[PDB]
Design an enzyme around this catalytic site. Structure first.
Site, mmCIF file in Angstrom:
data_model
loop_
_atom_site.group_PDB
_atom_site.id
_atom_site.type_symbol
_atom_site.label_atom_id
_atom_site.label_comp_id
_atom_site.label_asym_id
_atom_site.label_seq_id
_atom_site.Cartn_x
_atom_site.Cartn_y
_atom_site.Cartn_z
ATOM 1 N N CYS C 312 9.301 -55.775 104.968
ATOM 2 C CA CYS C 312 8.774 -56.716 105.956
ATOM 3 C C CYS C 312 8.367 -58.091 105.403
ATOM 4 C CB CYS C 312 7.657 -56.094 106.806
ATOM 5 S SG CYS C 312 7.038 -57.189 108.093
ATOM 6 N N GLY C 368 9.000 -45.386 104.778
ATOM 7 C CA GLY C 368 10.387 -45.828 104.851
ATOM 8 C C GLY C 368 11.302 -45.838 103.630
ATOM 9 N N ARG C 408 10.191 -55.035 119.725
ATOM 10 C CA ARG C 408 9.127 -54.795 118.757
ATOM 11 C C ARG C 408 8.522 -56.129 118.305
ATOM 12 N NH1 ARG C 408 7.019 -53.169 113.699
ATOM 13 N NH2 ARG C 408 6.382 -50.973 113.748
ATOM 14 N N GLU C 420 11.283 -60.881 111.261
ATOM 15 C CA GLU C 420 10.145 -60.484 110.430
ATOM 16 C C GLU C 420 10.470 -59.546 109.262
ATOM 17 O OE1 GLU C 420 7.271 -61.400 114.079
ATOM 18 O OE2 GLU C 420 6.297 -60.362 112.413
ATOM 19 N N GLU C 474 -2.431 -51.888 82.487
ATOM 20 C CA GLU C 474 -2.878 -50.767 81.681
ATOM 21 C C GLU C 474 -2.470 -49.456 82.347
ATOM 22 O OE1 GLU C 474 -6.488 -50.020 79.209
ATOM 23 O OE2 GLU C 474 -7.415 -49.480 81.141
#
Lengths: 490, 490, 490, 490
Positions: C312, C368, C408, C420, C474
């Site tokens: 995204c 996903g 969407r 997007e 680390e």
């Protein structure tokens, strides 16, 4: 407070150049008009806030001449013998106006070899000759013009000097008046004698034309270029110091990796006690406490920075250090209480960094890496991928330590070294003057933005603002492909 | 408070675009329905919150026409002569509806050369002809259609114009009614005369069909495209300004590197005093104090940002700056008190950045790098690795300064430059409209998320949340190999 | 509080996975013994805290079967037609135990074509045959064994079925008892009829041997695999929903980019009102306020995350988002007050990330990118540099939006898209089971360290500790050259 | 406080080596003079603060001999059988002074094969011979010098030993006095017998000349090299422990991935209860609470660090850990209350890191990766690009777990592994001594800077200062091309 030390372990926070930006401010002063001069002491006065580090890859006589000519100061390194280091100092002192009060001379019984020696050593175009060494009555002058007619230099002076009365002038003749005398009579040299004809000194057109060529020169009361010299803390320090002071050095840098060491503090007291008026620069220290201890010991300048150098590993191998901007600020906070200037030594990549160190309270900055590829620097040029390079090593590197920087790391006798520095190379930068022009240019712009007509205002006034790593990526050029760069930037 | 300045040196903290995300919020408004218009002043009204930077690689007449046609504003750069800059302004003003009230005209004694000149200069398809210059009685019109039959342009107008009474219309005829007249009589031009037949003006189908083609155009009260112009602080500023105002410029940008300089403040007062109604944009400033000083001097828009530009080195070389989001917010906090809009100038890589600057309080954003590879931008296309590029330079770069940006850096007379910028190249982006579509699209989405039906709500309401560098890596696409990108993203 | 909104703009601070580590704790429970089950609702019960995202590159019927078989849940994507999406749901429901209460059947007058169709559609090895469609008296069964003797499938069923009385069993016969009946009589199928011989259902050894093969399966009260389905907010949502509910879907995901949009809130109320018992998952939301608004509207699960997804660009292009760990925690704080579980959707690169999202309060994570290269995922394998790849696209990408994800992004009618998301590729990972084994393995280890015998204890108890970027370097493997990696790590 | 756990989730903040620098301090002590010795217990005393990790790629007998000879401690790994591990311990104990009180011996009826076996196993140049096994009357000695005349080793001892009375010495003869006896009589071996001539022991010039060769050796009260051994928490732990204690091991390391596990706590009590005086090192723990629980269970040393290792993935795959410097400090804060030393295990890249861990409160550091390319380490050298490499794997790696590190990860029976570590390679470093020289050298420099004459002062006194990522880039060498590196740095 039994547990206080234990609990305060992690509380302190430092900042360096990349964490911070200077905040612009109300300004009636343009970059062109600002004053960039700094006083490290009444006998040390710079026209630009720049010193070249004493390091065997950075400063020797030519670099010191060049720096002084631009208004800054060279520090001759100690990685040579005492004779050799004092000889270098002397070359710098005598570059201009060096023989006015303390001339060299010869007698007709010397060989042309001697005259060639002096002229080449000091780059002075003529040698006055006296009848003998006691009386010192001036009988004439052998010059570069006389020289071109001489084939075998083994011959005695008396044979090559054909007498004609030459124009001399009284003692205390000054450049401005020597300038017209040379002009009026059409001569390049002007011996100075007393009423009894005893040689007192010498003035050359070089002395005159250098004042015109380098109007910003940093000079002592006599008009000779300023020069400094590095000295370590060693059993032979005073000996080295003695010969330096006799060569008319203007400052020594007592140079150690830990300035807060009792051994350094004691050496400073001992040097201050023998030479009350000598300019004494001592470092390195990263703290307020260390700064106060050097000053009370008699240091009149304090040099700041532990680990920040482009070539230093001190922080990596010993784990030790303070971020340079905090270091400068912490040390400047203390020294200000005493009216003592500090030098920011190490870590400066760009001209902007310089501005930040000065706004954090340093009077002057000391540069290693930005000056090493410069033409006047000691090493010569190396080839890598068709482009010219210059070697640059940390005083902590094995290479530098073998050539006498060991005492700096308290390794002084050791068969097997543990280096605090590394060896590398920098691109050939051309003449020093161009690098200084950009450095001073960036300083003038920043002082313009901060509204500072001089460096004092800048230290007392300028405000920073902290940023993130993302703030740093914004500050640089970003996300566009660079076709051509600039001398100020990469 | 003797030591207050000294102790507050490091307290301030800034933020930029990459440190921060906008927090989503309750939203009844869809991206499709939101209003993206902004008022910089009653005489300056944009349908999109976008301005193209005056820079010689970014904006000239075509870019200004293109931007205005999309709803934004071009700022013509000053790196050309006064004649040249005013000529550019005039071309933009006259692109549409330019000859309605102030027509050009010729007499039959002019050559076809003159008619070709006007038509090519303004891209207007016909030239009205009058009996002579005093009376100005319309005798006819030479058009592009008349032109295709003419071989040698050295001939006089009277020879090529065969009389037929042509349809004219009264003064104050309006586009909507001109639209039907052209349609009814089947003509492309409509001269406007008075009862005595004196030419008052001209209307073309281009004037009409451009309103349909670019429904979002940013226009003045007369229906002509808006245009701005850059002006530096120089002894010749008023002269440059005078010719601009006579060319009907809608705004000047007094453009300097340090807006807080007394020299800039004085120039603004002096310009405001001569032109009380002129739109005056002044920058750059990074602070609240600087913002208030420009406004009191008479600036009616303030331009914000020091150093953030993709091509600027100001922060690196001078060490000076404020992180752009904090800068915008700090300046917007002050200007809001006066009802004054601010422009965010520099640092915007992606459409999201734009949203953030607007939510931080800017009314409008000004883009250099995102517009330089666009087709309407002044430079032409260069080849690197088979792909097309466009040169883009910082106004601080040596190249730009040689072509007249020197005054911006207070370098105005200098033989040797100290640049604040760099030179680079950007990929060819195609027509401007497509770049604006994505920019406005990203803005509409973000306003959708923040629940803002218009830009005012967005500035007054939207909340950010700060993140780390790890927060930034999450925000971008991560850890998957990208086969195909998008116009919004890389 | 006139200025409160304005001043609180920058106060909030977020954290993501890489900013943070889980703190180890007193533990009497070993990784082997911990419980990893989660209840999203009484009708939704997972044996592992994993869901596969509905995305056209991630989940379809096989992926949903595979996930359910491991104990998690697939969400079938909506980028197909309503018929097509409900058909997929039905395939998953009928994979195991699907014909026990609601069998398919044929009459002797059907062609073998029909029998081949059913067997291939559901992967069920035999088709019961009835005398006619009303009475539904079982007359026999055509199976895969009968099939291998048939050449032309165009023939009628009655011709190929040679009668022998076949063993049937009463209604409500159960797997455990069907297991012995099949064993005792040596048969693979067991039709279920009533006292009048009317076919009621069918049981196969597949139904039995699948329980043994996948002992951790996530199943409804009837013993059929769980499946979910994605639904957008569109005029056709209820229609899509109706066909899904008729296919016995266990959950719908109302999926939008902004969950806080009034349009989404209204759709949830409207769906909750028509189907009071339907499991309703709604997202995405990044805040506490948004979380409460979805719950009051009737969402019984809330899906969390704006922008964090590997593919995204929402945060970059719209500038919008919240760092995922803070998002999960902020949303979990609110939902806990209601006894509502949350799903962490997006941003998980490694199994450790999963643990962190669950310890931050999520009941379940949705993946996903970690599932796209898996064998059961919809796309097939692509070649790049000799290695196998699978395409993976963001629902925001232009490609995905053209295939029906437009709603969407509130782009639903648009001729020109503003994406997007982005398109990319992931390496082929082999069978899903191996990827889940490592995921669940990492979870079991972390729960071991945190002393959590189950996921509830982990959400209520576990403590994090924040680290810097240096803390992150680390945590990864550092400064050694990696000869061979692992399935858990890169 | 119902919600307290929930709200304190994100409050804690950790630090690691790269976040921090040590602050220089007033120093009267030079690097040369500082004491680097550490007492882990009265029976464990190191002359350098270094331990080699028990890992199958790091420590076996030679590495343990080498480490002990330099003043540190080897930990023999458990990835071998109990017989094999105890045999390794025995080889280390018997390297020097091993046969003084507990000699091996033979009878004339043994074959030369046996004598060759003992000499090769212990690297001891001669084998005493006794009349028989009960009386143990010394009849003579077969040595390396006797051996060179023997062709077939299948022959009996009695045949090769020609009698001459050999010089023996009384029991409790000491090295210093054995040194002159060997010198006076010109012999290399000195059997020790009682008044009845019964062999009590043996002294060799090797025993004497090793004291001169390795003056810094870490030795027990008997003058034998110290050695440790790794033991997991397994049903067979006590058995492994029993054979180790019988081989005179000085310490066991009970080694687990989670020290706070009840299973580990119980094993420590059970081992402490059977061997009240045994040195018991237990880990790993990252917290104060875990540290107190191990100590109360009877651990007399605590080993600190979860995840920081160069080869560990624990933090990535399980999401679990604490940044190592905070871990050390948090654990050292607790153990100090009990007078218990801690070991910092993992994460140390450079000598500076070591200094930091010790200044954070660790008594000793344990190194894997810095010791794996060393000559004495178990693996042999691999070729990659013409340069020599050594394999180095995490105890968490699949490879290590298959060879018996499974119990460490609580995977003890598992068919399918879920690794916490990875496999890699490190450059061949030459003899261990050179690596230790640089390590100890960096420690001596840092202690010089911090003004610490010994390690206690350093833990109780030294102060750190936190820096940003930009602070880290300053600390390393920056922005110069490195032509030659150093043994301390990369």
């Amino acid at each position: 407070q039994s547990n206080a030390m234990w609990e305060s372990k992690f509380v302190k926070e430092g900042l360096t150049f990349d964490d911070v930006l200077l905040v612009p401010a109300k300004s009636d002063v343009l970059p062109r008009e600002v004053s960039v001069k700094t006083v490290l002491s009444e006998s040390l006065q710079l026209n630009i806030p720049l010193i070249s580090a004493g390091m065997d890859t950075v400063t020797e006589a030519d670099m010191a001449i060049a720096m002084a000519r631009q208004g800054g100061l060279g520090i001759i390194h100690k990685n040579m013998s005492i004779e050799q280091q004092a000889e270098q100092v002397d070359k710098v002192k005598r570059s201009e106006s060096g023989v006015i009060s303390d001339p060299f001379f010869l007698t007709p019984e010397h060989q042309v070899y001697d005259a060639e020696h002096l002229m080449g050593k000091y780059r002075i175009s003529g040698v006055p000759v006296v009848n003998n060494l006691d009386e010192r009555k001036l009988v004439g002058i052998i010059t570069n013009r006389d020289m071109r007619f001489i084939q075998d230099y083994s011959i005695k002076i008396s044979d090559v000097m054909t007498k004609e009365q030459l124009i001399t002038a009284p003692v205390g003749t000054t450049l401005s008046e020597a300038e017209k005398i040379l002009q009026k009579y059409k001569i390049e040299k002007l011996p100075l004698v007393d009423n009894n004809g005893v040689l007192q000194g010498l003035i050359t057109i070089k002395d005159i034309e250098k004042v015109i060529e380098f109007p910003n020169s940093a000079k002592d009361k006599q008009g000779r270029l300023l020069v400094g010299a590095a000295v370590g803390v060693t059993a032979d320090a005073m000996t080295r110091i003695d010969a330096l002071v006799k060569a008319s050095v203007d400052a020594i840098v007592l140079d150690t990796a830990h300035g807060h060491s009792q051994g350094v503090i004691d050496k400073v007291k001992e040097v201050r006690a023998k030479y009350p008026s000598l300019n004494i620069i001592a470092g390195n220290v990263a703290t307020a406490e260390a700064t106060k201890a050097l000053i009370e010991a008699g240091a009149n300048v304090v040099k700041v920075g532990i680990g920040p150098g482009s070539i230093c590993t001190t922080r990596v191998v010993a784990g030790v250090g303070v971020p340079q901007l905090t270091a400068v600020y912490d040390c400047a906070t203390e020294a200000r209480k005493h009216g003592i200037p500090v030098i920011a030594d190490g870590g400066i990549k760009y001209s902007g960094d310089m501005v930040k160190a000065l706004a954090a309270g340093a009077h002057v900055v000391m540069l290693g890496s930005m000056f090493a590829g410069v033409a006047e620097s000691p090493g010569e040029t190396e080839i890598y991928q068709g482009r010219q390079f210059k070697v640059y090593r940390g005083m902590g590197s094995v290479g530098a330590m073998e050539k006498g920087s060991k005492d700096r790391y308290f390794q002084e006798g050791n068969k097997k070294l543990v280096p605090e520095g590394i060896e590398g190379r920098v691109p050939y930068k051309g003449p020093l003057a161009d690098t200084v022009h950009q450095l001073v240019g960036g300083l003038r712009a920043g002082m313009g933005y901060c509204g500072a007509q001089d460096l004092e205002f800048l230290r007392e006034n300028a405000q920073f603002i902290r940023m993130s790593g993302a703030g740093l990526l914004e500050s640089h050029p970003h996300h566009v492909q660079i076709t051509k760069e600039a001398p100020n930037y990469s």
